[PDB]
Amino acid sequence: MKLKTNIRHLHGIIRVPGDKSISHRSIIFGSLAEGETKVYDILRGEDVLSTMQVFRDLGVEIEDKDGVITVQGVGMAGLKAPQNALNMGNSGTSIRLISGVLAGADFEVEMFGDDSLSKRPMDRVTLPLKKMGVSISGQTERDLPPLRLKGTKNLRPIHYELPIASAQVKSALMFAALQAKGESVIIEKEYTRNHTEDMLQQFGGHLSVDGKKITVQGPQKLTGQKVVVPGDISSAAFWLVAGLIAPNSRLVLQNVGINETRTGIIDVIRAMGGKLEITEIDPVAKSATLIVESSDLKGTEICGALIPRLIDELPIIALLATQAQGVTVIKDAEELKVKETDRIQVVADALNSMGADITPTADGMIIKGKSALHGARVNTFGDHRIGMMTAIAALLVADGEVELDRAEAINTSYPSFFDDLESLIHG
């Protein structure tokens, strides 16, 4: 589709949709717990719907009525063999976390995904899951989907040192540990989003966190909860940058989750000199309203430790970097290559075809700032973030046109994205 170009001003209040990571987990915890769980303001992007259907296929009743998700929990050993193979679509979070969820399933199930998902490695989760007694295998040594998994009633606790900064692997193992008999210790390589840890407690579960060492005692019984989903910072991120980058702009993003393990983009905007105001802070829900203004940026360095706090924001941060004076380096981000697309190569190609000066590297990219952007055709390749990044980049194209193919990929995490864009463009 044709993207809006040469924007003159962006003014408005935006309430971004629910956090995808938390939305996914709300369905998992709701299904594994006893009693009912209700989720409010859940993200209805396609990936979360995939998670919901997966559990329905596993025998879980999940009702979406009057904007509220109601889940009738089945226990912790209540999932049942599905009639057909489980469709994980484009959701990496779904297949990886659910692989751990099924660690105790006394049956074999198949798990497939779309073209994109089938190119992502699952070995990072099968290796440790097989240590617990789970039987799992995929295509090639990397264990690419489709996967075949058979759990066991005799799950052994896990003792694992994660070789990569992955929140998904940590979470899968935590869900598994919850079913195993004994004490499991999962050691993070670097701190990653801790939504699983937070929600396990919210659902009556227990764990001990000593720095990067996470200890989970199993097996546990969880209790249904009322879950209220906060706005997704990863979605708010597209507007945070749009507001700093577009001329004569001031955007107010309300109800944005502000969990410290997810706020990496705030630190970067800071270091780059962007005008960012944080207000209406809810110290408990961990949310706030972020206000951004047209700013003149300076390049910065993004590396180790900060990476997991903003892996998903590197695509738009690259665009952000594109508008800053000087060079900005991104490293220790080899994990990008393994996302819905190789976010190093696709991001570099996409933006270079538009304004340029992005040098892809083995562990990130180097961007030389302040490029006037121009028209181009960009393909999403099934990655919602590539699409939304191009959409904001297009706003800065003074002359020319931008065609974005496979734009529907954006509905994977932000269906009303273009609606919100339109609302800011007027007034």
Ligand SMILES: O=C(O)C1=C[C@@H](OP(=O)(O)O)[C@@H](O)[C@H](O[C@@](CF)(OP(=O)(O)O)C(=O)O)C1
């Ligand atoms: O646990 C989670 O919910 C996530 C943590 C990160 O993945 P990882 O554990 O591999 O670093 C994130 O990169 C991941 O975000 C992505 C990655 F492509 O989600 P998917 O893996 O589900 O596609 C995204 O939406 O960009 C969501």
